[PDB]
Amino acid sequence: ASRVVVNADRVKGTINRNIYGHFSEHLGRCIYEGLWVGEDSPIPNTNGIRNDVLEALKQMKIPVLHWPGGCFADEYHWKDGVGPREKRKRMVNTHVIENNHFGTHEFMMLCELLGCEPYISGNVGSGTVQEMSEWVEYITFDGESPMANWRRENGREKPWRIKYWGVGNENWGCGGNMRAEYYADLYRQFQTYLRNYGDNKLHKIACGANTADYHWTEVLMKQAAPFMHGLSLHYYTVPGPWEKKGPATGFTTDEWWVTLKKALFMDELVTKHSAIMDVYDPDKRIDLIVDEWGTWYDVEPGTNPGFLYQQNSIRDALVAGATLHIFHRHCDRVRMANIAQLVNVMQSVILTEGERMLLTPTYHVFNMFKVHQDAELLDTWESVERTGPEGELPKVSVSASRAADGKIHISLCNLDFETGASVDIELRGLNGGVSATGTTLTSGRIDGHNTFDEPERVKPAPFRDFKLEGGHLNASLPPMSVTVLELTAG
């Protein structure tokens, strides 16, 4: 038995809802087919966006969406994506179509339809200071100017509000192959000209490190902390070497254990990057933003490697659940995260094929865990069984929060695919008794996944395999599972 104590009356922090964020690049079929079908598509759509996906994402309570993020942000020139559809810039490669039908107006519309915060990244690597300044002005200025007037011409009279603004992305790599010292100087310069217009308040985000580049964090904090509201971090879970990452399905048990071990490395990265941030920002003013994370496999056989299409199994659900738990544990500093990527690209919550779609196991974890969004983290301590071939992994990952209505949610991941996991949970600091319901997500196969023909092989089901004798909640978690228990006082 793994043992847990929940101090239901000790709040340790707030889980910012933006921890549950998402990210979409102009890449493969993430924007085009995934979301954007066009107004006259036979696929039922609202203003050009397919309804099946909209409804699923609203249900999931998507808090924030990052666009254009990834390598494309430091390639993109935003003016190419506004104005009359047919004068929008067209790029066609025969080896891939970018028509720029999806641009700033369509993105802001999409966010309003979803009820999520927009998070835009401007172009540092191939952009200019004036260009980025003008984008913010276009979006947020209530006065009279070429840019604000242009926004009005293009159909949006009043400005939008936007908080999250990224000043470049991946500037150490595809965003300019920059030394940290150099990017910090560009960052300081660019951010200067991003104004707060009207009652808008920008939340300027500097591009942070790739994986274990601690030097980057040090330099950005030391040189640029006073000029930023947030600093990003990127870490992908890649089972195999770069040149042979391994497949999304039909993988070996070694690949299971490696995948989960690599996912849990997030905790170390976040710990060590935060420790550096603490030196320069002891009050933790500046957010840590893990705006690229998730699994990265070889593409599905006979798909274009460039489109990054991969399946999504219960393995991916465990990665997501455990990784979100890690963000919980760091919710004193980590205030946003964004899984790569929303639709048809990397560790997506949704895959599409024409008018058909499915919800991935990854979708189900986001949907189950939405109870943690803006919840109060509760003090828990735990002593858990080990698993994996050398006892390398924790058998169980657990996290507890308190929702605004006073309900308590306890989410638990069983990382062992082979056997269930017993957990005794002791609840302290309660007033009344409590009752509990539960939901669980599991599979009969290590690589269990949904398909267009069978979109529901892997989905949440009622969870009843626990007993609550006031004070102790004993549970038998299924193998390879993610479970949420809801406790109500009374």
Nearest to 114 by CA among 62, 162, 50, 43: 62
Nearer to a second copy, 9 or 454 (CB): 9
Q: In sequence order, what are the residues at sequence separation of 6 or more whose Cβ sits closer than 8 angstroms to the Cβ of residue 241?
A: none
**Distance of alpha carbon 211 from alpha carbon 232, whole angstroms:** 11
Within 60-119, which residues bind a second copy (CB under 8 A)? 75, 77, 89-95
292 is catalytic: yes
Enclosing H/E stretch for 207: strand 203-210
- Applying CB under 8 A, among 1, 44, 58, 143 the residue interacting with a second copy is 143
- Under the binding rule (CB under 8 A), the answer on residue 145 touching a second copy is yes
- Under the binding rule (CB under 8 A), the answer on residue 144 touching a second copy is yes
- Under the binding rule (CB under 8 A), the answer on residue 174 touching a second copy is yes
**Distance of alpha carbon 40 from alpha carbon 26, whole angstroms:** 21
Closest approach of a second copy to the CB of residue 72, in Å: 13
**Distance of alpha carbon 166 from alpha carbon 147, whole angstroms:** 20
- Applying CB under 8 A, among 47, 51, 126, 435 the residue interacting with a second copy is 126
- Under the binding rule (CB under 8 A), the answer on residue 176 touching a second copy is yes
Q: In a 3-state reduction of DSSP, which class is residue 254?
A: helix
- Applying CB under 8 A, among 70, 81, 103, 175 the residue interacting with a second copy is 175
Rounded to the nearest angstrom, the gap between the alpha carbon of residue 438 and the centroid of all alpha carbons in its chain is 24
CA dihedral 111, 114, 117, 122 (to 10 degrees): -30
- Under the binding rule (CB under 8 A), the answer on residue 140 touching a second copy is no
170 is catalytic: yes
Q: In sequence order, what are the residues at sequence separation of 6 or more whose Cβ sits closer than 8 angstroms to the Cβ of residue 424?
A: 1, 2, 3, 4, 472, 473, 474
Closest approach of a second copy to the CB of residue 276, in Å: 6
Nearer to a second copy, 97 or 461 (CB): 97
Closest approach of a second copy to the CB of residue 124, in Å: 9
Within 224-283, which residues bind a second copy (CB under 8 A)? 227, 271-272, 275-276, 278-279, 282
Nearer to a second copy, 198 or 479 (CB): 198
Nearest to 376 by CA among 422, 426, 440, 429: 429
Closest approach of a second copy to the CB of residue 121, in Å: 16
How many alpha carbons fall within 13 Å on the CB side of residue 8?
Answer: 22
**Distance of alpha carbon 484 from alpha carbon 274, whole angstroms:** 28
The catalytic position among 170, 255, 376, 385 is 170
Site for a second copy, rule CB under 8 A: 5, 7, 10, 75, 77, 89-95, 125-130, 133, 142-146, 174-179, 182, 185, 188-189, 191-193, 198, 214, 223, 227, 271-272, 275-276, 278-279, 282, 381, 428
Q: What are the catalytic residues? A: 170, 292
